[PDB]
Design a protein around this nucleic acid. Structure first.
Ligand code: TTP
Ligand code: MG
Ligand code: MG
Length: 342
DNA sequence: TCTAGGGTCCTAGGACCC
DNA sequence: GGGTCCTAGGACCC
């Protein structure tokens, strides 16, 4: 009863799009990210920049210290959305069982597909070739019987390559697979697991489920499952967005309420425009604000509210400012909405 | 080096309901 | 006491 799941993942997505649209960037180190003066981080980097150690989520000041000639780009999100829509239309040529996880990646369930003699290996190759033929961008892919193995597999032969895990190969693959490779196991969880002597799925296989359930809750069940190749999550295709948020980090911290309110005045019409694209009457379930301080602690306060309203967001930010700020600088202000449950 | 902005999901205490 | 909604925080992902 094995499913065939493909995970398709665009190579250096934002940067690949910028290089196609400006071939002068093809061989120099480039990254999409905010300037050091805007206190930015790297969204992504091309392979010439990665060679220096430049990575996603790296602070831009660190990226430039590693790669002084890094060319920093602002990002063209409509260009990326356009490429995303196109590759999702290419996925639809092969199956309707498509769960996009972000602009540049998706799960495909091709169990019931009849496109390349039921070969998921060849469907993945054909999708990657079509994407290259029609978008001049490359993609990598992973093929496995379950979601998480497919997603791990798509990383192992990038860029512009794929990797297939058959059911026969799953036990040997798992034995030495680091836990940190499992989606959902991040730095904090991996360090906790490491401090129990648990580094790989093989380690977790020698663990008692009751033990993991005590020390991790529902996460310990997931750890126990994945360590055996168990991942029953179905490819959905029905997921909908639940929130809309708009936030900005200032180049310098602000110390005065007048400055905070001015920022909100600039953020609010952007939040309204994005909400209106999906709910034109602006009806919502909750709205709220976010402050982040110069020491990097952050607070959110949100509440039931029927319709996007600027003055209530200002009032709420003023309460949060007055109450939970303690003379610190503020580096970030954000606005937030929770969408109604349709 | 000095730490984004777009999000999802889980936890957990108290309110509230029965 | 058992279920369920509000809310803040935080790990995590892209
Ligand atoms: C991981 C990450 C990605 N992104 C954006 C930029 C990425 O190009 C896009 C998709 O992310 P990824 O697929 O994680 O990264 P990538 O495509 O650039 O690199 P890879 O070739 O390894 O797949 O999302 C961020 O803005 N911040 C992040 O921390
Ligand atoms: Mg990618
Ligand atoms: Mg991706």
């Amino acid at each position: 009863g094995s499913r065939k799941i493909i995970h398709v993942d665009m190579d250096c997505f934002f940067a690949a799009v910028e290089m196609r649209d400006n071939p002068a960037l093809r061989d120099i180190p480039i990254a999409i990210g905010g300037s050091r003066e805007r206190r930015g981080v790297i969204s992504t980097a091309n392979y010439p920049a990665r060679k220096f150690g430049v990575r996603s989520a790296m602070p831009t000041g660190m990226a430039l210290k590693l790669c002084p000639h890094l060319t920093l780009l602002p990002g063209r999100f409509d260009a990326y959305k356009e490429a995303s829509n196109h590759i999702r239309e290419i996925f639809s040529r092969y199956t309707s069982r498509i769960e996009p996880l972000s602009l540049d990646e998706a799960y495909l369930d091709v169990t019931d597909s009849v496109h390349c003699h039921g070969s998921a290996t060849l469907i993945a190759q054909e999708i990657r070739q079509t994407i290259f033929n029609e978008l001049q961008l490359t993609a990598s892919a992973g093929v496995a019987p379950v979601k998480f193995l497919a997603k791990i597999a798509s990383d192992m032969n990038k860029p512009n390559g794929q990797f297939v895990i058959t059911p026969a190969e799953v036990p040997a693959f798992l034995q030495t697979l680091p836990l940190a490779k499992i989606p959902g196991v991040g730095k904090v969880s991996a360090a906790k697991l490491e401090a129990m002597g648990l580094r790989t799925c093989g380690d977790v296989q020698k663990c008692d489920l009751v033990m993991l359930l005590k020390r991790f809750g529902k996460f310990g069940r997931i750890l126990w499952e994945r360590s055996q190749g168990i991942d029953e999550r179905d490819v959905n295709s029905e997921r909908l967005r639940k929130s809309v948020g708009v936030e900005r980090t200032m180049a310098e911290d602000i110390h005065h309420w007048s400055e905070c309110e001015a920022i909100i005045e600039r953020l609010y019409p952007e939040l309204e425009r994005r909400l209106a694209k999906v709910k034109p009457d602006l009806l919502i379930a909750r709205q709220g604000v976010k402050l982040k301080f110069d020491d990097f602690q952050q607070t959110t306060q949100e509440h039931v509210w029927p319709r996007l309203n600027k003055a209530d967001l200002i009032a709420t930010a003023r309460k949060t400012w007055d109450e939970r700020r303690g003379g610190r600088g503020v580096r970030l202000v954000g606005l937030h909405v929770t969408l109604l449950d349709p």
